[PDB]
Structures are given as structure tokens and as C-alpha cells.
Write a protein that binds this ligand. Sequence first.
Ligand SMILES: [Mg+2]
Lengths: 99, 497, 54, 50, 95
Amino acid sequence: TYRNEILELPETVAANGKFGGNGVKSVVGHTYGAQVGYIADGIFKSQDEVDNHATQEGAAVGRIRYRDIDHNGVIDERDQNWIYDPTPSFSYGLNIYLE
Amino acid sequence: PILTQKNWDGTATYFQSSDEHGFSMYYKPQVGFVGDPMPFYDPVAKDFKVMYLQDYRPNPEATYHPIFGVATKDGATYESLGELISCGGRDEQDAAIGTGGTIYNPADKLYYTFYTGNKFKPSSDQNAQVVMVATSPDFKTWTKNRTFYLKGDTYGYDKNDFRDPFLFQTEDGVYHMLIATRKNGKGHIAEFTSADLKEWESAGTFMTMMWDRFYECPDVFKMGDWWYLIYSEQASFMRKVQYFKGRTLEDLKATTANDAGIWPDNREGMLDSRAFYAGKTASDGTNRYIWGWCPTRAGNDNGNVGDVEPEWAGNLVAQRLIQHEDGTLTLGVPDAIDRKYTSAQEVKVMAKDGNMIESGKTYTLGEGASVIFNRLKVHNKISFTVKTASNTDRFGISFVRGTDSASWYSIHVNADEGKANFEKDGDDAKYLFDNKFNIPADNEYRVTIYSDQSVCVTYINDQLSFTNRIYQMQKNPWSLCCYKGEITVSDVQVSTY
Amino acid sequence: GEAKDVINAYYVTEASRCSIYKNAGFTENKNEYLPVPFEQISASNGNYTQNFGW
Amino acid sequence: MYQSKMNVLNTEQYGRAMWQAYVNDGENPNGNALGYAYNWGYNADGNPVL
Amino acid sequence: DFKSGLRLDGDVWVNSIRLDEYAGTVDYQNKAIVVGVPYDYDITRMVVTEMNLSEGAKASIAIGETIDFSLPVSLTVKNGDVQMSYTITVKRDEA
Ligand SMILES: [Mg+2]
């Protein structure tokens, strides 16, 4: 097992996010290649659910419901968080030889 | 995942509601919109198999009017039968299908439907509108009779104006087919007689029209002791459903024989405002129901009524005809629709801005007083009684009325003008349209609004019927306002289902 | 300066003949200019100011 | 041998999926203009069925 | 294992048709069938005499039925689960 982290990085590299963050948030302090995206809280199943959820463009019945991270009542590009970590918890192998 | 529920009951702030793709009470298929209805009573199944045209917002270029049917035995529950009459080919005369009628012949046990094929980009020598017929053995599958082509120019009638074949059988057993055509520049309702619905004889002109207008989807029927002709006005300025009355068929025909203009009542035979069109009736033997379509609004805006004429197609609305002792006709809520609403919602006040006072369940409003109630729901039934000080008051009911709502959409019952007016209040001050009705002499009004999502029908003391398309109305507060007189409201009840 | 009014009228008029304009809407003081790119703003920390309305 | 064979729609499944998309959007499926002709209706609840 | 069992083979060609005693020329590029009549024939009553399409192919128009051909008539030929549409037109040998 191992843990990876980026401690310092040039400002333009952090901004364009070639090493992670998708250009939305700086990868500094996070795993190499980590990505930032929305959070999918299931799908809408009724107009009541659509109305009760925080307002978002294109919401309808059967569409994906995105969590309101900042509790502002509206879903936008600020409602994103670290969702992907390309580092396994642990990798193992086993070789068995019978004669 | 955790779902958060907002406090709908307790907040009067305006909210952005949305409409489902399909309606239940005022039927609307999940795909497309309903156009001109075609009511029909099945003598076998003992139900209403109302048929219609399936319109689409991006209509194809040439072949755009598929026909769909729906069974609504009660008048409130609608189950769709799918497509029945497929639109013809591009080059065929029935590329687009107009309104028609339907009869059942027990002689051969066959359902015959008559419709109007519209030729696409017709030439000078080609008839623009031709009446055709399709036959069914069980009302499930239909075969168009390719040998029938009733041309308008054959009997001296207009080539481009030959629409709405209405079918009815008299007591003697002969069948009559009525066409709203044009003869030598005049609106003529022409009649064709038959005894087997395969060969027709032109029985001259059944009736003439008034002031060179045009009548859409005519329908002749009998109600107890009177013969009525219901029709829809094609004129852009009017664009509303009217009717004519007569003791006998001969009396009805002699009515407005040469611009006589014998109106059935003081309101020129008006039945509903511009939000109701192509009204056509049918009976089950005990009740008479008229079906029409409430139009949609361009850019789903209540204020965008649309100049010249409103939009086409919309939501299928069923009302119950009310025949009075003098022969006058009015529209009433169907019994099934009334009884569908079961759950009762408590009402409460959210705003106190005018000089109004609250005394238990009875409220009193003066000049400029307005009271705002709690939110509505997707289906609503609002019933109350209003007593005015005199017979010249201006009270009104406003929907989409939030605390912060810049503009709300109101219906004002103006007694001085003796009518109702659908207008846009708030920061537009725009007058949309109106509807005339008889003012009660006791200054009493029994207001009942039945609303399905975005289509609301208002009934005033069994006398006035008023259809409206009000988006954002569901899940929003509604208010009562007074402008010139003094009013007293009581017995406010809100029911949902 | 009439961009907002003209664009809203165009949206309302053309929503009938094009279904993409069902949900269209022009903001009074936000959509008359493209926003300054977020990547550029992040790169020049404390130097670029986003346009009004964002 | 190739084991991880991705399961893609056949012709009938593709037509069914496109019809479902059209009816969910509320548009006329017969307007697909890909040569499909659908016979379809509604159930008791009003949900489209193919 | 992958086939949908929708029998797509379905030959739907139309060999020829005969309205009354007149044959029709068939063009497959635009799916048209043109029949000529001697500029006085009653074009409102024609009985479809013979129509050979293919093996297993069924047409919407039957054999022996009478049709009005004043305007083009749409014909659908179905084989299995496939179909093809043709337009049949009749012209009065205009010169
Ligand atoms: Mg947010």
C-alpha cells in the first residue's frame, strides 16, 4: 500500500489542472491525478422531489439529482468536491505452487 | 442520500412550478397535444369515446394531423386508445386531417367516421379540402374507404372551404352531414342527406352565417324541447364559442335567415372565453358534455395571450351543459370532476395589507383590501361565497400571488360592466380578455375553481364558466382583491386529490 | 444596449419553431459579455476580476 | 479469446430505446426519420407502451 | 446469442401491378408506380386485378378491391418485420 500527495506546485499548473482538479480546484495537498466533480444523490422520481430539491437547470422527473454542497439553494459550478482518488487501498498477490 | 423537504405550508414566497408532460383530469397525452375534440357515445360500451387530433409543436411540413382517441366514460378519467386514423401520404389528399364526426350503424354493426383531408400545397384544379370516411368493426382498427371522395366543388361549394363534417341521425332514421362551407363568398352550413351513409344528396343550404364570419365545427342537437346549434367562431377578433337556440329545427334554420341575428340571450350566445375552442357535445342519454381544448401560451407565459388568434391545440377540457327553463345554455363542472376532489386542506391568511378585517371564517374587504391565502397544490378545488354591497362592485381572484410577486394574474368580476375580465395585475396593468355573463340581482356569488396543474376552470353561481391557462399556479398562493366596492367572503374551502 | 430585450423577444418568438429555446433566458447584466476564464483568474491570483453578475 | 465483449443494443433493442427516449421527451417517436415505424399506445395509468 | 430475432431478411420488392387492364411502370429509386390511361378513362373506380410482390410479402392494398386513383395512393409492402412504401399514380396520357 502507499499514499501519494502533492505539496507544492506552480500556480499555472495548479490552475490548468493537468495533474488533477480538472482546473476547478488546486490539486496541492491531494493525490496525484485526483479529480473534482459534482455529487449524484440518485435521480428524481417525482415532481414533488424535483420541487423539494434545490433548484437546478434542467431538473425534471428521471434526471440526476446533484447535491448542494454549499447549501446556497442553487446548483452551479461551485457545488463540486473531491470525488476521485486513483490510489488503491492495497494491492496484493499470491503464488501457489504444488508438486 | 438524504432528501430535504421545504416548508411548503408556511411560506407565501413565489415559487417556480413546472407542468408534467401529461395531465390526468383535463386530459393531455404525454406525447403531443390535443386539438379539436370529437365526442362520441358508444352505444355498445355505454361510454364516451372522444377522439381528437394529435398536434405537435414542431409539426411536419405536409402530413401533420394524426388522429388519436380516448375513452372517458365518467368525464374525468381518460384512457387512451392510441392512434386510430393515420395521416395519409404527402401527395394524398388526406395528408392533414381536419375535424369530423362519427356514427354507429347497427344495420352492419360498423362505426363510420367522417373527416376532412387537407391537400398539401394544392393546385388550382385540386380541391383543398375533401371529406373522407373510415370504417371500423370494433372501434379498434380502421380502414379508410378509398372509393369515397366528396368534393366541395361538385355541388357549387368552395374548393378551399369545406370543413368539419358533422353527422347526426334524425328520428325518421335518415342521416345528415353538415359542412361549414362557403358559397359565392358567404358562410353557408350545407346539408347532405343519406339513408345508408354511402350515397349523399345535397339538400341545399341548411343555414347561413352572420356578417360574413366563419363557423368552426358546427354541431346540431336537441335538448328536451329546444334545438341547438353550437359552433366556434373562426373570426380572429372573436375566436370564441357561441350557440343558437330554437324550439324546432325549422325555427333554428329560420333563425338569422338573412342577418336576422336572433341571439339566444343578452350575451350574444357566448359560452366561454378565448381559452375554450372547438366545443363539441355528446350525450349518454342523461347528461350532455361538451369537449374543447384550452390553448397553450407562447413561451409558457400567462400574459402572452397572443394577438389576432391564440395558439393551437392544448388541453382537453370537458364541461357539462346546463339548460335553463328559458332555453339558455351554460357550462357546469362534471359530477365526476367535482367528486374526484376528496382531501380537504385547511386555509389560512398570509398577508394583511388592506383595510380588511377577519371575523372567524368570514372576511370583509373594502376598497383596496386584499387577502392572500396559503399555497395551492397540483390539483385544487376552491369554493367560497362572496356577497357584495351593491351590483356595481369590482372584486377579483388572483393567482401566482406571492409576497414578492411583481405581477399576478387576476380574474375580476366587474358588476358595473356586468362581466368577468382576465387581466395581468402587478407591474404590467395589462388587460387580456373578458367574458360576459348575467349579473345576479342579490349581489351573491358562489365561486368554484377547479384547477389541474396549469388549467383552471371557474364557475360563478351556476351561471358563468371561465377557462384559463395559468402557468406556475400550482403550489403558489392565491388572493382575493377588491378595487371599487365592498365585499364579504365566506365558506372558503380548498380541496385536493 | 437593447441586447437583453431583443434576445428575450427572439427567445419567446423562436421557441415555437425551435424546441431548444424552451428554457432559454437572458440575464439583464450578466450575459452580455463572456466571463473571464476561471483558469486565468486562478492563475493570476488577486489580479483578474470577473465581470459583473458572476 | 475475447471475453470482455461489451453488450451493445441490437436492432430491436436500439429501436425500443429510441422510442422510449422520444416518448419520455414527449415528442412523436414516428418522427425519428431513421426508418423505424412504431405501433404504440398507453396503459391504464397513461404510461406509453410499445 | 446476439441476434434480436426480428427477421430482417424480408424482401419487399414489387414486381408489377395491373389496374384493370393496364400495367404500371415501377421505379425503385423514388418508389413510384406510374399507370397510364387513354386520356378519357374513369380514374375513380379501378379494381386491383393482379399484384405480385415477393415470397412472404403482404401489401396494404388487397386483390379485387376498387380504389379511387384521382390522387396518388400510398401502398405499404410488409415482409416479416420490415416494410417499404410506394406511391401509385395514374395519368391520363396528357399531351
Ligand atoms: Mg450551491
